[PDB]
Design brief:
Two copies of one chain form a homodimer.
Chain A lengths: L6 E5 L4 H11 L5 E5 H7 L3 H9 L2 E8 L3 H13 L4 E5 L4 H14 L2 E5 L11 H14 L4 E3 L5 H11 L4 E4 L9 E4 L1 H4 L4 H9 L2
Parallel strand pairs in A: 1-2, 1-8, 2-3, 3-4, 4-5, 5-6, 6-7, 7-8
Helix pairs in contact in A: 1-3, 4-5
The complex binds cytidine-5'-monophosphate (2 copies).
The site of one cytidine-5'-monophosphate has 13 residues of chain A, from strand 8 and helix 8.
């Protein structure tokens, strides 16, 4: 439950070469990488084992699983079989959909992160209003890992009060007052010098 | 579209999926595929369905990310050959619009998922269903995918989206479903049948007897 330097690289690139280049350059500073469907749909799910075998990265699949229970189970099993250490799941489809993911994780010895809220434009339409109930639902389903919205620390304070001191929270300095790790993408992966960018961030 | 019947190819092994789809091709030309098959076999399987059978493919990916990422998922998906992609409306208007913009650029289609009917859907989705469908109408969404249960829910959805929108829904069927949906989605009853082709052929006959206007 410990992320190296409390810094997670959000690898949102879709090209294998740039993805691997950047990951290899920041491995002396970061050991946890979050990847999404753009990369895996473009390069194949086998890229996950590549990240792990090549660099020893812990991999969080940010797939925002949001289907019915039976399908969620299949997606999680396929993702864990490919090597993901954790998978991010939506809470809006309800408790049984989340439970299906948690069960595959228990069975396979992996982890599920519950997405409690989103902060992009439009998230205020339906997600914002359900966020507190979704976080509380997570606590009651035994969820121990949460992903918070890209927002000001004040709001993470509220989420932290709901999930408790023992849960693990990750979110896109002040943020680290409430989150266990911060997620950084572009400022690192588009940098001409990814290593220097990561090293600078860790300076805090 | 062909025969108002869409095949839900939910099997995870490449062999059976390709086999079954090929056997029913005479009656069905539109197939819906989800993440399990794609993540296990690769996105290349989409081009395979299209190149080999001339199938129209609907990627049931229920896209639910932020606008920028939704754009990339859609682009990756249409590039692989999908004719349309299913997108969640709960994340909001901007996330749905990002998908519509990529579909517009590439000449493809977006299907908005407005509600679900599985256990737990009542916690947050059910209460937002009508508002999400109306959001779709406001965004100019023209294709919708309905829930799997309760035809009383289809009549409501049809009422909100209007007669000019296209609606596909899982399954007194097929008659019951086609009273509101333009096409029915059928999976197990076809792909688990001993003679898939026979199952599809049968279903198509029933639909023929309905004499559905427009
Ligand atoms: N509006 C936004 C933008 C980005 N993010 C998250 O932050 C991560 C990294 O973002 P950056 O590339 O902008 O640093 C993304 O992968 C995404 O999960 C978010 O949660 N909301
Ligand atoms: N419980 C279920 C079962 C199936 N379905 C939908 O109906 C499609 C085909 O279902 P059948 O196999 O039951 O005909 C599935 O691919 C899925 O999208 C659902 O929404 N809820």
């Amino acid at each position: 439950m410990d992320v190296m330097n409390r810094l997670i690289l959000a690898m949102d690139l879709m090209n294998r070469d740039d993805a691997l280049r950047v990951t290899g350059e920041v491995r002396e500073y970061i050991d946890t990488v979050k990847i999404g469907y753009p990369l895996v749909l473009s390069e194949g799910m086998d890229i996950i084992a590549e990240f792990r075998k090549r660099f020893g990265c812990r991999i969080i699949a940010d797939f925002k699983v949001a289907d019915i229970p039976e399908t969620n189970e299949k997606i999680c099993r396929a993702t864990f079989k490919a090597g993901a250490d954790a998978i991010i799941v939506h809470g809006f489809p309800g408790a049984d959909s989340v439970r299906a993911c948690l069960n595959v994780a228990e069975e396979m010895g992996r982890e599920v992160f519950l997405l409690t809220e989103m902060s992009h434009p439009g998230a205020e339409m339906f997600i914002q209003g359900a966020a507190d109930e979704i976080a509380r639902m997570g606590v009651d389903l035994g969820v121990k890992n949460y992903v918070g919205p890209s927002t000001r620390p004040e709001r993470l304070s509220r989420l932290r009060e709901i999930i408790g001191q023992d849960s693990f929270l990750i979110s896109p300095g002040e943020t680290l007052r409430f989150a266990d790790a911060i997620i950084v993408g572009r400022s690192i992966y588009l940098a001409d010098n990814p290593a220097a960018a990561a090293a600078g961030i860790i300076e805090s």
